[PDB]
Design a protein around this ligand. Structure first.
Ligand SMILES: CC/C=C\C/C=C\C/C=C\C/C=C/C/C=C/CCCCOC[C@H](COP(=O)(O)OCCN)OC(=O)CCCCCCCCCCCCCCCCC
Ligand SMILES: CC/C=C\C/C=C\C/C=C\C/C=C/C/C=C/CCCCOC[C@H](COP(=O)(O)OCCN)OC(=O)CCCCCCCCCCCCCCCCC
Ligand SMILES: CCOC(=O)NCCOc1ccc(Oc2ccccc2)cc1
Ligand SMILES: CCOC(=O)NCCOc1ccc(Oc2ccccc2)cc1
Lengths: 642, 642
């Protein structure tokens, strides 16, 4: 007895809709006999097969397949001593026919010498095309034959065929049945064909009719028609009463990405281009800001010409074209207007960003204001000033103008004296800013956001790759079919980590190279710890993919969950703005987020040069390691409750 | 003669080896007979059914079905005079049996009374559950029965069935075939049953065998056996040699979104919460910064106490505890240290942000510096200054510290003189900033990024909703099955635009109420024009969804394309940084992007109050309208060859 399913109970009930899929089964299959299984549309004939191979655990009862209980330490039924053909196609579209044959042969530990011979024989027998056409390029009716040949490659002693001939030309169905009846001539192998239409399953040695979760007929077809006095079987049925499984599986993972150009460009060429636009468009100070200057001491000749000519040594001549000489030539463009009202009108129409309006007697009232000193009069104070009207609608441009206009005066003051034999330190404010402890006197916004996007690109791209890989391949039956071949769920997960890790050290090597070596983002700290932190953040991201691909079955559902949780963090992690600006009731909450405490640690390791032994640099390692454990605990808990 | 396809011809594929699929098909069906087509591949026969219905087009071949032709307005087949049952389940999820029956009846313009009567009859006859179970909750074998019942509602004169009895028990096939032979008793109706297993082609009236795209046998079953002298058809086969359609289409659209909680939260509850975090975390100036002040005029007692007391009116007492009194109490917290070196290493350890270090003789030297004036000996200049060491690693925080310290000295100077009978105007730099034309002297970053988040939330959510709705519907066969029901492509497009417009009009009033009314973002312009511009961006976003769904056939491919184009555009449209910072060459290209010109128009309409008749404002309407036309041109061009 190859299979005994005596007294098989199985319930899918909910105490509201009790689905008694398997009420009481008494099935027995003898070695060397083809055993058909006819019934309804997968009412109980599609879960009994899964329970035979150990995919689904049985309820109270008995089971005995080949050696003993399925899925035990014998390696009886989940192994190389079985052949499984699923109801649907469970092949890889990006693989050649020969590539698929070798990949499945390596799982069973078959040498490449005999695999080629078996492949050639199978190709000749099943009139398939040459062994160079991809499975995705074959029609839907001839990849079923490829799957059938895959199930027949290793010639096991127990075949579980599920609809082996449904869309097959009967001319090449007579040959299939001849082969099936020939291989079972001796008492070596056995075939279990659970088809759907009765009329073809008549050459089998034994058949079984299944209805309402119970086999109501077991005997041979001839002692069925003779017993029930029937001219056909249809009228009978009218009964109203371990290192080889990781080398050969990593190659598949590294090939399903190379063949898909769209996936390759998304996870390798987007990070490269995104960090190029960011380093070129965000952070740099505005340049080329126009200014409408009114000079009442010179002669108005044109729009972009004033004939600014003063004297240098002493005897201050004009003191208005001299100040404009000290103006910064980088981020200020000067255009001249004839009237104070005309200049203001230009600003109101968006043709400029401000006005200056040096008065008619600025030189006379300025030299007489710094001479008298602290006993001046309101007349000279109100006629020796530059009246600036500014368009302060933009914070970042209203600050550059408000700073370059005052810095240019300090150089002007330090030039007027100093050329008149005086002490330059006299023209200063008592608030003297010494050399900064960290950074430089001219900081950049790019250096503040660059650490914030290193950990964002790496984290998100790991979630997208892991979630899609484990959802598409699970929903297509690739996990279930490969499990029957003996691939325990210990190297399926281990290989994915290795594949994810390798594709991950290549993303870090491109983001860091294109932002530190090129575009010159300062890295004052150790580059050794920067790489480790970036890699560790991603491993937290990959672990998040397991959580996403454990509660969502549909492809579209994981996208909303991934996007609906990422966006909200990243307005709380302080990537684009300092963390200090948030109110101190939500700052505490925002501290326990994934990326918030690692971004701060990476920022302090680049813009300050701190080491690991600093309570702000190692807090970013503990925070990103705890989340790895938390994400690996929720995923296990989810699978337990499902 | 209901169907005549004499001299049919069809071919497509590669130029070198075209796939001839309907080479010399000669098929003829007479009214009142159950024609039965038997094939092997299952793909060369389905195309014949599609050509018969009218979905496909022949290649130099005569056809005549029902009146004159499929697809014409004279005697067209697609409508209420044909019944289609697709190969796959083309039903709607989250729809009750009764609801889908009513919807498909309304498509055919049938009154509710007859719809209910036919629903009751079909429910009783086909052995289905009560008319309140959602279709997505039914088993695999019951959805097919529901689809068959749907195809039997309007009792037309031609039934194009495709494997209707495949997974039902024999006790039901007998009743189904009895009903099928009863309905075509008189010469009223016709049935074309294209099954796949040759056992139910015995109650038929004219069997047609199909192989290699030809009809090698078209002749009645019994006389076929008599002619070929056998006893089974299997042995014979071994012979190798318009307002009603928009109301129903709109109720369906608003129900497929209300029944899905996940979809509703993503397009309605996401932007409401997104604009709440943004208004609370990004834009606000940092507060709570700490300073390590060293005072050598008082006595060091603790870390948070110095006993700062001085003289108010005249007779300057300390002039160091007085300057600290003018410091801003909001964004600066004061901590005291005993030594200048003990307060500098505090900065190096991250415990503070700066130091002040008022010297021991600050008061005497300060009052002796402003008294002499311009003839001060250099020793007094170097002993009456506040030496500030700043942590300038952060650009944003370092700006406030450099500003709140210098601005506090202006108040200190204006308080020193003014209490000593002097004009405060004496302590002023000649660069005097008048009242700003725009900006109100207090710019905020959150007021610069808020225009541009409205157009980003609306644009992206329109792309995701439209692209993911036309891809799922089309790939499931829902669009094709509704087309056979007479629903023209112009009504599918019009019904989707109306639904999208209502959705984008409901998620626009939420991002505006929650950001302009609640969080007080200034709106100096007209609110009427802002609404139109935001809506115009939604239409532009939706029109981009048509382009993506016209070139992407897989769900996972549209996600990469949508994310692979929105990310670079958002980083080049100047949303989080002024466009003036970009290089001149890259700035020119950026202006041609969809959101680059629209964001600038909205920003000038909120922070400046400009009207429509301004070149900086109406340029955003022309830019966003050209893209609507451009996106509607590429989509039509894509469908030209597809
Ligand atoms: C003023 C208001 C303020 C804010 C608004 C409020 C609340 C919203 C806040 C954000 C809105 C949106 C989120 C976007 C969501 C769309 C959710 C619906 C998609 C999926 O949920 C349908 C699925 C998958 O579908 P599936 O199982 O495969 O269906 C089988 C049938 N074929 O299934 C199921 O039901 C199961 C249910 C799962 C749903 C989330 C389970 C949560 C557990 C842990 C998740 C996160 C853990 C911690 C995060 C760490 C932070 C980085
Ligand atoms: C804000 C946005 C608005 C305007 C922006 C601008 C321009 C838009 C005007 C039109 C938009 C586009 C037309 C695009 C294409 C029409 C043919 C293409 C797809 C047709 O299809 C092909 C397959 C699928 O077909 P296929 O692979 O060939 O067949 C086998 C099926 N598996 O599509 C896919 O998957 C695509 C998968 C993602 C590909 C890109 C993702 C991210 C790439 C980042 C850029 C990297 C490029 C190099 C840059 C180097 C660094 C500087
Ligand atoms: C070895 C694996 O190779 C594959 O064949 N992987 C295919 C998956 O590729 C995708 C990439 C991005 C994407 O989009 C998002 C975005 C957010 C959340 C989730 C998905 C979906 C799929
Ligand atoms: C008419 C009612 O619609 C539905 O019944 N549900 C589908 C809408 O929900 C989705 C949400 C996100 C998503 O992901 C993306 C993202 C970018 C591009 C394309 C798809 C796809 C679909």
């Amino acid at each position: 007895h190859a299979v005994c399913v005596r007294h098989a109970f199985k319930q899918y009930g909910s105490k509201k809709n009790p689905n008694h899929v398997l009420s009481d089964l008494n099935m027995t299959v003898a070695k060397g006999t083809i055993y058909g299984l006819l019934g309804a549309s997968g009412c109980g004939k599609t879960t009994l097969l899964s329970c035979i191979v150990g995919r689904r655990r049985l309820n109270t009862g008995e089971i005995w397949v080949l050696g003993g209980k399925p899925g035990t330490k014998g390696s009886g039924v989940p192994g190389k001593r079985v052949g499984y053909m699923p109801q649907e196609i469970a092949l890889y579209g990006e693989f050649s026919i020969k590539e698929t044959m070798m990949y499945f042969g390596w799982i069973f530990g078959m040498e490449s010498s005999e695999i080629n011979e078996r492949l050639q024989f199978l190709l000749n027998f099943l009139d398939l095309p040459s062994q160079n056409r991809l499975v995705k390029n074959l029609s839907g009716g001839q990849q079923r034959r490829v799957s059938f040949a895959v199930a027949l490659m290793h010639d096991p002693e127990l075949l579980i065929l599920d609809e082996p001939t449904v869309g097959v030309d009967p001319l090449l169905r007579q040959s299939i049945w001849n082969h099936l009846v020939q291989i079972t001539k001796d008492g070596n192998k056995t075939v279990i064909i659970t088809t759907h239409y009765i009329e073809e399953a008549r050459q089998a040695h034994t058949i079984g009719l299944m209805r309402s979760g119970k086999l109501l007929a077991e005997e041979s077809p001839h002692v069925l028609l003779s017993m029930y006095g029937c001219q056909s079987l249809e009228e009978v049925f009218l009964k109203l009463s371990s290192w080889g499984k990781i080398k050969a599986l990593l190659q598949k993972n590294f090939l399903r990405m190379w063949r898909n150009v769209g996936v390759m460009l998304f996870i390798f060429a987007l990070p490269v281009m995104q960090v190029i636009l960011f380093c070129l468009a965000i952070g740099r100070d505005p340049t080329g800001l126009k200014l409408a200057i009114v000079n009442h001491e010179k002669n108005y000749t044109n729009q972009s010409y004033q004939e600014c000519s003063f004297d240098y040594g002493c005897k201050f001549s004009y003191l208005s074209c001299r100040y404009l000489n000290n103006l910064r030539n980088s981020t200020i463009l000067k255009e001249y207007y004839p009237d104070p009202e005309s200049a203001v009108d230009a600003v109101k129409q968006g043709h400029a960003w401000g006005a200056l309006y040096f008065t008619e007697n600025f030189t006379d009232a300025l030299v007489a204001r710094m001479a008298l000193g602290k006993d001046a009069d309101p007349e000279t104070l109100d006629q020796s000033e530059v009246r600036v009207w500014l368009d302060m609608s933009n914070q970042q441009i209203g600050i550059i103008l408000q700073r370059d206009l005052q810095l240019s005066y300090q150089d002007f003051a330090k030039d007027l004296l100093g050329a008149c034999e005086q002490n330059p330190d006299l023209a200063e404010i008592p608030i003297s800013f010494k050399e900064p402890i960290y950074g430089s006197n001219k900081p950049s916004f790019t250096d503040f956001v660059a650490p914030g996007v290193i950990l964002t690109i790496v984290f998100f791209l790991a979630v997208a790759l892991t979630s899609s890989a484990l959802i598409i391949e699970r929903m297509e039956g690739l996990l279930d079919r490969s499990w029957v071949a003996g691939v325990t769920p210990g190297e399926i997960l281990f290989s994915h980590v290795v594949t994810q890790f390798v594709v991950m050290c290549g993303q870090t090597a491109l983001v860091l190279i294109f932002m530190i070596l090129v575009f010159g983002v300062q890295c004052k700290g150790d580059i050794g710890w920067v790489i480790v932190l970036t890699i560790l953040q991603g491993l937290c991201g990959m672990c998040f993919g397991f959580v996403i691909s454990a509660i969502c079955e549909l492809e579209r559902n994981a996208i909303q969950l991934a996007l609906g949780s990422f966006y909200p963090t990243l307005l709380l992690s302080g990537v684009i703005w300092p963390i200090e600006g948030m109110p101190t009731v939500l700052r505490y909450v925002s501290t326990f987020l994934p990326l918030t405490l690692a971004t701060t640690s990476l920022r302090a390791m680049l813009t300050r040069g701190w080491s690991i032994a600093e309570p702000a640099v190692y807090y970013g390692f503990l925070a990103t390691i705890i989340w790895i454990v938390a994400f690996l605990t929720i995923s296990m808990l989810v699978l337990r409750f499902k």
